[PDB]
Amino acid sequence: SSMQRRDALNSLTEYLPKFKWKESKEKILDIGCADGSVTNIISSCCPTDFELFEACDVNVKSVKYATEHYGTSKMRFRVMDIESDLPKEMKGKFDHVFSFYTLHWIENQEKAFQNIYDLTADDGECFLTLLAQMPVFNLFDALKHTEKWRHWLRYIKNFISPYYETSDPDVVIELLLKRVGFRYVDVRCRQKKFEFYDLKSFRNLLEAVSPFKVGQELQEELIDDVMEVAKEMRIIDTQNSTAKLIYNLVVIHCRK
């Protein structure tokens, strides 16, 4: 979506100058590729001569879309889970590891970051963006607690960032990257604003990211109520008919 695009571009444009680029043909990995659109933006950034670029995700519908639309000779689109053990093949395989807007889904944080360290080759670089505090999380968790929906979304799986309510999350993550054994580590917490100029654009997002898969005949009525609690929470401005999201995106830049 627009937010991920804007944040991916802005995150790169800033940190690209700070990267070490090995002279020899490179081995790169992006984690959570989804559409492949954003990982295509990443591939386009410097090294024209690299051996292989790999891009993995959990969604199977997406990896196929992304392999058929963006997949090439040196752009392999695999299915993999970071919350899971690696094959012996991939330990120390990759020179540069990327992952944007993906690591706030992992139940077991340390396992995923421990993997990331093991994938990164000797004298390699990481670059991962990650959501902490985000209103959308509070907006949906608010609906799950509504008198109407309380009972029929009591046991629903609602995936919220592990860091959406943690103090100094930059420090928490920094220490977890030093335990796992990264030599250099830079974790900054970036406050971001994103605006919606009509409600149909905001609605379009809510529909997309909603963590509540339900009957398509309820899907419409559910977001009707979500758009309503968004008015109550002042995520949308009723008078101007606009929406505004201020959220924290932690960006991580580390070497081993």
Structure tokens at 202: 């905001």
Query: Residue 132 binds what, of a copy of itself, ligand SAH, none (CB under 5 to 8 Å, by partner type)?
Result: a copy of itself
- Binding pattern for the stretch 73-112 against ligand SAH, x by CB under 6 A and - elsewhere: --------xxx----------------xxx--xx------
Q: Does residue number 109 form part of the binding site for a copy of itself (CB under 8 A)? A: no
CA distance 180 to 97: 15
Task: Give the nearest distance from C-beta 173 to a copy of itself in angstroms.
Answer: 11
Residue type, 97: V
Q: Are 104 and 137 in contact (CB under 8 A)?
A: no
Task: Give the nearest distance from C-beta 224 to ligand SAH in angstroms.
Answer: 25
Which of 26, 57, 125, 174 binds ligand SAH (CB under 6 A)? It is: 57
Nearer Cβ to ligand SAH (22/91): 91
How far lies 250's CA from each of 7, 186, 193, 236, in Å? 11, 10, 14, 24
Q: Which among 191, 195, 200, 206 has a CA at the least distance from the CA of 247?
A: 191
C-alpha dihedral over 213, 216, 218, 222, to 10 degrees?
A: 60
Q: Which among 62, 53, 60, 56 has a CA at the least distance from the CA of 86?
A: 56
Query: Residue 192 binds what, of ligand SAH, a copy of itself, none (CB under 5 to 8 Å, by partner type)?
Result: a copy of itself
Query: Using CB under 8 A as the criterion, which residues of the chain lie in contact with a copy of itself when the complex forms?
Result: 10, 132-133, 138, 142, 145, 163-170, 188-193, 232-234, 239, 244, 246, 248
Binding site residues, ligand SAH, CB under 6 A: 4, 8, 31-32, 34, 38, 57-59, 62, 81-83, 100-102, 105-106
